[PDB]
Design a protein around this ligand. Structure first.
Ligand SMILES: [Mg+2]
Ligand SMILES: [Mg+2]
Ligand SMILES: [Mg+2]
Ligand SMILES: [Mg+2]
Ligand SMILES: [Mg+2]
Ligand SMILES: [Mg+2]
Ligand SMILES: [Mg+2]
Ligand SMILES: [Mg+2]
Ligand SMILES: [Mg+2]
Ligand SMILES: [Mg+2]
Ligand SMILES: [Mg+2]
Ligand SMILES: [Mg+2]
Ligand SMILES: [Mg+2]
Ligand SMILES: [Mg+2]
Ligand SMILES: [Mg+2]
Ligand SMILES: [Mg+2]
Ligand SMILES: [Mg+2]
Ligand SMILES: [Mg+2]
Ligand SMILES: [Mg+2]
Ligand SMILES: [Mg+2]
Ligand SMILES: [Mg+2]
Ligand SMILES: [Mg+2]
Ligand SMILES: [Mg+2]
Lengths: 86, 82, 62, 80, 47, 205
RNA sequence: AAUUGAAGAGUUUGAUCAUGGCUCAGAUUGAACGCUGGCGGCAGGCCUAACACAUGCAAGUCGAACGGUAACAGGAAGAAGCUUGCUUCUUUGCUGACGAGUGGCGGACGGGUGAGUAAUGUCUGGGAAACUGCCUGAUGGAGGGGGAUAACUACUGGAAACGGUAGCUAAUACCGCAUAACGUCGCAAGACCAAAGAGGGGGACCUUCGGGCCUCUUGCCAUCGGAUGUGCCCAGAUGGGAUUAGCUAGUAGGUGGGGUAACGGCUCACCUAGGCGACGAUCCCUAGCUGGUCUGAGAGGAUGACCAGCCACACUGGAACUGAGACACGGUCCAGACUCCUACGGGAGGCAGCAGUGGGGAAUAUUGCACAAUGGGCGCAAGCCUGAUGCAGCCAUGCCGCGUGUAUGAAGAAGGCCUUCGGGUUGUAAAGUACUUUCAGCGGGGAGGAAGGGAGUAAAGUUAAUACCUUUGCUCAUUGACGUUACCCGCAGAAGAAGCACCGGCUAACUCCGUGCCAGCAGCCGCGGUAAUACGGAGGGUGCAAGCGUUAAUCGGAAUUACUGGGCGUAAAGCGCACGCAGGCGGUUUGUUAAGUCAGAUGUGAAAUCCCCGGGCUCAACCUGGGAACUGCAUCUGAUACUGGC
C-alpha cells in the first residue's frame, strides 16, 4: 500500500473483516441450530432456535453485513422447513 | 449522482460547451444521458452564444439532478436575459 | 533475404548493417528487395545530381 | 398483448421440457434470396402437454433452466 | 542486468552510442562469441 | 504556395494570354507567345487527350494563381455544391478575394492583387483581410484602407482596369478606391476559352 | 435544402479479335526511409516487447465525526538584563489551525493498454427474477444504557519491515435493550428488525455557570419511490478453416436442498437420458467489439490509431476481504518468475497513470507549467489534492492557410546550354528603376478565455426574536498556468523564407556524353553488344511545392469472386451417367389466415463523424446551431396483388 489512505483502508478492512466474520459466523451457527433441530425432527426445539436467531439475522441485515433479501431468504427457507415438519 | 454540466467540445483556445445531463462518474466530454443545450464563452457580440433547454433541466432537477456551479450561473444569466 | 544495391558503387561488405525497402529487381530470379542508399550504414551514392533522393546523395553547395 | 413465437417441436423426451424449432423467413443480406432460418429454443412445459412434431406457440420468460427461457402458451395441430 | 545483452545498434556509429574504437571492438567480440585462411591451412598441411 | 518565376513562360506553354502581366505594354511584344517555352518550343507537340485536359487545368490554376492541392479542394467544394460543377469551380476561383480585387482594378495583375491582400491593403465590410483565397460573398463591399489608398501602384491598377473590360457582377469607385460584389459570376461573365468541363473530367480519373 | 454518381491504359501475336493474368495512372495512412526544409493555425504522434524498469509526481480529503496537540501564531498566569514598556523565557488546546491517529467518504471515478475473449464479449432489439453510495421526492422515527479500541505512556523483541506486553481515552466507531410500521417472515394472530449526534446565534422559568431550553443548518435511520449505475436472461447479427464431424456426465432436463442482491447446474443429493450438430456443434488458427474510418457511383471491400460507447486486462497464476459498487492499475492474502534492500533472520516492489530510461523496432515527443477554466474527489465552507483536464515543449507526421516579393524592364546584356553557325534558348528571366512590407526582427500598446468566491450591507424566507443561516440585490477590491498570448500600431529595408520527382511507351515533359549487354536502369513493356529522347551528367522542360519522392499497407481501377455485375462446346469451367433424403424451387381456381411483402404509426438506432442549410474563429482547416441521416430492429394498427401457411 503506497498511499496512506490505502494503508488505512487495509488495516480498517482487516479490522472490519474480523468484526464481520464474528457476527456472520455467529449467525451461521444460529441458523445451523434451527437446521439441526429440523434434521432431528424436534419441532418445538426448531421453533425456539428460529426465535433465537431470526432477530439476530434481522439485526445483521440492518447493519449491512448480510443483505436484507438474504436475511429474508433464510427466514423463508427456515419457515418453510419448520412448517413442513409441523 | 446525475448532474447537469458543461462538456468542453471545441478547438484549442476556443472552448464550446454542451450543457449535458451526465452521470457525475462518467467523463466530462464522454458519456451522457441527454444533451440539454450549449454555451459558448467566446461567442462575441452578434446574436447567440448561450442557449439551454430549461424545461429539461427543471425535469432533471425534479428527478434529482445536481447542476454544476458554472452551469447554475449560466442558467441564472439566461433567466435574467429572459 | 537477398537485396539489391542500387546506384553505382558501395561501401557494403560482410557483417555490415543496412536498411532494405522492398520493390523487386525483376530480371534477378530471387531478389525482391532494394537497399536504401543513405540510410543507417550504407552511404549515399558518390557524385550524382539528379534523382538524389533515390540514392541518398546530399545536396551539393553551389 | 405480450410477445410470442410459433414453431414446431423437434423433441419432447426430457421431462417438463420441449425443444421447439422456430422457422423464421429472413432475407439474405447480400444476395437477396429469402432463406428459412431455424431457432431451436428449449421451452418449458408443465404436465408434458406437447409431443414431438406438434406446432406450439411459445413466449419468452425468466430462464427456467440453463438453456430454457421460453414457456409454451398454447398447442396448435398436434396429432400426426 | 544479470544477463549480458548488447544491442547490434551500439556497433552502428551513426546513432551515436560508442565513440571509442576499443568499446566497439569489445561489443563486436560478444556477438562472435555467441556465434561460435582455408588456403593457408591447406598449404600448412601440405608442408 | 505561389509561383515565383517567369510569368510569361506559363502563358506561352498554355498558348493564350493568362493576364499574368498588367497589360500596359502588350503580351505579344514582351514574349514569343506563339512558341512554347524552351529549346523545343518550335517542335509542335502532338498532344494527348489527358494532356490537353491537364494543360487546361494548368491554365486555370495559373490564371488565378491557385496551386494544385488548393485547386483540387476548390473542385471538390464545387462538386459538393449544387448545379454545374465546372461553373461552380469557376465561381469559387473568381470569388477569391485577391481575384476580386484584381477585377475591380486595385491589382494590375492578379499577383499584385494577392500581394496587396497579403499586405493588409484590402478590407471587406470594414474588416482587413490578409487572405487571398477569401470567398467574397454576394452583397459584400470591398475597399482599400486609408493607409494604402495613397499608393501609386493602386492608381496604376485602376487605370489599367479602366483601359480594359469591366465585369458585370462587380461595382467599383475609382476615387474612393472601393466597390461592391453584387452576385456570383455566371459562366457568360467569364471568358469562353476556359473549358471547365475538361478540368472536371481530369478530377474524375 | 440533406449521397446530383460510374473514364481507362500497357503488356500474350508477324498482325487480329477474344479469353486471361500480371501491371500503371486515383484516393488513402498513427506511416517509415531518402533528399531537402520559412512561418503559422488546427490536428496527430510506440502500430513492434501485455518486455524490463532507476527518479519524481498520477488520490486524497474532511478538526463543523472524535479524543488530542508533533510544529506554528495569538492571547492568558508567573518571572528575568529591567530602554518606565514591553521585547523575552516558562506553563495551559483557551482560540486560528494541524503532525500522527481513530472515524467518514473517496481509493469501483478519472487515466491506461488491447494480452485474453469468436462469446458470463460487442451491436441491435426485446425482456424479468434483481441490487443501487452520494443526489433526490415522500412518509415516520432519532429514547435510554453500555463495554471496548487505537491515539498517548513505561518496560521491551526486531538490522529494518514491523512489533509485543501492561495501562489510559473519545467518538456520527462498536454493541445490546427499549421503541417498530408503509418493513421482513407468514394463511393469520403474532414474532422480529434502526439510528447519531454535530455546527452557528440567543430572551426568560433555569444553571454541578460545561450546558439544559429555543432556534436554524446539516448529518443519522427505516420504508416506499425517483433517477443513475450495475448484475441477469433471450433472439438475431457479430472472422477464417471440415485437409477440424462427431461432441458433452454437471453434460440436457427434472424434484428437493443449499447459495446469490437477483433468475439460473450457480452448487450438492437422488432420478430421467438426454442436449448440441453439416442452418457447421466440436477442435484448431486469428481477433477486442461498435459508433465509425478509408475506399467505392453504389452495392461492396478493407479496416477499427485519434474522438465517443460497450467489453476485457493491470508483473504471471489464483483467492477472497472491505464495500452501495471490486473479486479492486497506484488496496489485502498466497504462490510463481523477475529487480532491490538486508545485520541473512527476513523484507520491499509492480509505469498497459504522466513524464522518463533501457530494450525491441523502419518508426512515434519533454523527468514542462498550472489548477486560471472545464470536470472529479472530499468538506458547511474557505480550501487542499487532481500528470483528468488545460496549456506549454519536441517531430513537416497530416490537413489547411500564408509567405518566399509586386509592377516594370531589350542591350533580347553577360555567363550557361544547344547550334542548319545565322542565332535561340535560358528569358522579362537577371541587373537597373519604381512600389509594397505577409511572416520573421525590434519597441510599444493590448482583448477574450472569468463565471464564480470574499467582505460589508438592505430586503424577504425561518423562529419566542430586528440574532445566525438561507435566498435576492448592490457597491468594494479581486481571482490567468498559457503569456514578450490573440490582436493593433510604428520603425528600417527585398532585405532573412525553394526544393524534390520525373521527362522511351504507358505518362505531363528532350536535346546534348562516357561507355558498350559493361557500368547501370526498371512499376509493367522493356532500355544498354561503338552513333542510347530509357543508364550518369549538363542545359531545357514537366509535375507537384515546403514538401517532394521511394517503400509498406488498404480499397479503387480489377465486371479480376460478377448481390448490383462474369462465366463454363473450342480459352479455366457441365459431376461418366443415373436414383434420391435434406434443401431450393414449384400448374391452376376459391376461401381463409397475415408469417414474408407493402403502408402508416409508435419506441428506439447514444453523441461526435458523414451529408444539408446555417453561425463562429481575418479565410481555411478546426469548432459549432439546427436539421437530415443512421437504409436497422421491435411493437401496434391496417392493406392482401404477389410469396408462404392452413
Ligand atoms: Mg429454494
Ligand atoms: Mg534501436
Ligand atoms: Mg500547403
Ligand atoms: Mg533533415
Ligand atoms: Mg489533520
Ligand atoms: Mg453507526
Ligand atoms: Mg432447484
Ligand atoms: Mg490479440
Ligand atoms: Mg467499382
Ligand atoms: Mg487479479
Ligand atoms: Mg459485502
Ligand atoms: Mg502504476
Ligand atoms: Mg549568350
Ligand atoms: Mg509580424
Ligand atoms: Mg508525352
Ligand atoms: Mg531512373
Ligand atoms: Mg470488385
Ligand atoms: Mg470471365
Ligand atoms: Mg477447356
Ligand atoms: Mg455429360
Ligand atoms: Mg466564414
Ligand atoms: Mg447519430
Ligand atoms: Mg394463396
Amino acid at each position: 500500500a503506497n498511499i496512506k489512505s490505502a494503508k488505512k483502508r487495509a488495516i480498517q478492512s482487516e479490522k472490519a473483516r474480523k468484526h464481520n466474520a464474528s457476527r456472520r459466523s455467529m449467525m451461521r451457527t444460529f441458523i445451523k441450530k434451527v437446521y439441526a433441530a429440523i434434521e432431528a425432527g424436534d419441532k418445538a426445539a426448531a421453533q425456539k432456535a428460529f426465535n433465537e436467531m431470526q432477530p439476530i439475522v434481522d439485526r445483521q441485515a440492518a447493519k449491512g453485513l448480510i443483505h436484507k433479501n438474504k436475511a429474508a431468504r433464510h427466514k423463508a427457507n427456515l419457515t418453510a422447513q419448520i412448517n413442513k415438519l409441523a | 449522482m446525475v448532474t447537469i454540466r458543461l462538456a468542453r467540445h471545441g478547438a484549442k483556445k476556443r472552448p464550446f460547451y454542451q450543457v449535458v445531463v451526465a452521470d457525475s462518474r462518467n467523463a466530462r466530454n464522454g458519456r451522457f444521458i441527454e444533451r440539454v443545450g450549449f454555451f459558448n464563452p467566446i461567442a462575441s457580440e452578434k446574436e447567440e452564444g448561450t442557449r439551454l433547454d430549461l424545461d429539461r433541466i427543471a425535469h432533471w432537477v425534479g428527478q434529482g439532478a445536481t447542476i454544476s456551479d458554472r452551469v447554475a450561473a449560466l442558467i441564472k444569466e439566461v433567466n435574467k436575459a429572459a | 533475404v537477398t537485396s539489391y544495391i542500387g546506384g553505382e558503387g558501395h561501401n557494403l561488405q560482410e557483417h555490415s548493417v543496412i536498411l532494405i525497402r522492398g520493390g523487386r529487381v525483376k530480371d534477378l530470379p530471387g531478389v525482391r528487395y532494394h537497399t536504401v542508399r543513405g540510410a543507417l550504414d550504407c552511404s549515399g551514392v558518390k557524385d550524382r545530381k539528379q534523382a538524389r533522393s533515390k540514392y541518398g546523395v546530399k545536396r551539393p553547395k553551389a | 398483448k405480450i410477445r410470442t413465437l410459433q414453431g414446431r417441436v423437434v423433441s419432447d423426451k426430457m421431462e417438463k421440457s420441449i425443444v421447439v424449432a422456430i422457422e423464421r423467413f429472413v432475407k439474405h443480406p447480400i444476395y437477396g434470396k429469402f432463406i428459412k432460418r431455424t431457432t431451436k429454443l428449449h421451452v418449458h412445459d408443465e404436465n408434458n402437454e406437447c409431443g414431438i412434431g406438434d406446432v406450439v406457440e411459445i413466449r419468452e420468460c425468466r430462464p427456467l433452466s440453463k438453456t430454457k427461457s421460453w414457456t409454451l402458451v398454447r398447442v396448435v395441430e398436434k396429432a400426426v | 542486468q544479470k544477463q549480458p545483452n548488447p544491442s547490434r545498434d551500439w556497433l552502428n556509429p551513426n546513432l551515436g552510442y560508442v565513440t571509442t574504437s576499443r568499446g566497439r571492438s569489445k561489443i563486436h567480440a560478444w556477438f562472435r562469441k555467441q556465434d561460435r585462411a582455408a588456403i593457408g591451412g591447406g598449404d600448412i598441411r601440405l608442408n | 504556395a505561389r509561383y515565383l518565376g517567369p510569368k510569361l513562360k506559363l502563358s506561352r506553354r498554355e498558348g493564350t494570354d493568362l493576364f499574368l502581366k498588367s497589360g500596359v505594354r502588350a503580351i505579344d511584344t514582351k514574349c514569343k507567345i506563339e512558341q512554347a517555352p524552351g529549346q523545343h518550343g518550335a517542335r509542335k507537340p502532338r498532344l494527348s487527350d489527358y494532356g490537353v485536359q491537364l494543360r487546361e487545368k494548368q491554365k486555370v490554376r495559373r490564371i488565378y494563381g491557385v496551386l494544385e492541392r488548393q485547386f483540387r479542394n476548390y473542385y471538390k467544394e464545387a462538386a459538393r455544391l449544387k448545379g454545374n460543377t465546372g461553373e461552380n469551380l469557376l465561381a469559387l476561383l473568381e470569388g477569391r478575394l485577391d481575384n476580386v480585387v484584381y477585377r475591380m482594378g486595385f491589382g494590375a495583375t492578379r499577383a499584385e492583387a494577392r500581394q496587396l491582400v497579403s499586405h493588409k491593403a484590402i478590407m471587406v465590410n470594414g474588416r482587413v483581410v490578409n487572405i487571398a483565397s477569401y470567398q467574397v460573398s454576394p452583397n459584400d463591399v470591398v475597399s482599400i484602407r486609408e493607409k494604402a489608398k495613397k499608393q501609386s501602384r493602386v492608381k496604376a491598377a485602376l487605370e489599367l482596369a479602366e483601359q480594359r473590360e469591366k465585369p458585370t457582377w462587380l461595382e467599383v469607385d475609382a476615387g474612393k478606391m472601393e466597390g461592391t460584389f453584387k452576385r456570383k459570376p455566371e459562366r457568360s461573365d467569364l471568358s469562353a476559352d476556359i473549358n471547365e468541363h475538361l478540368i472536371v473530367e481530369l478530377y474524375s480519373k
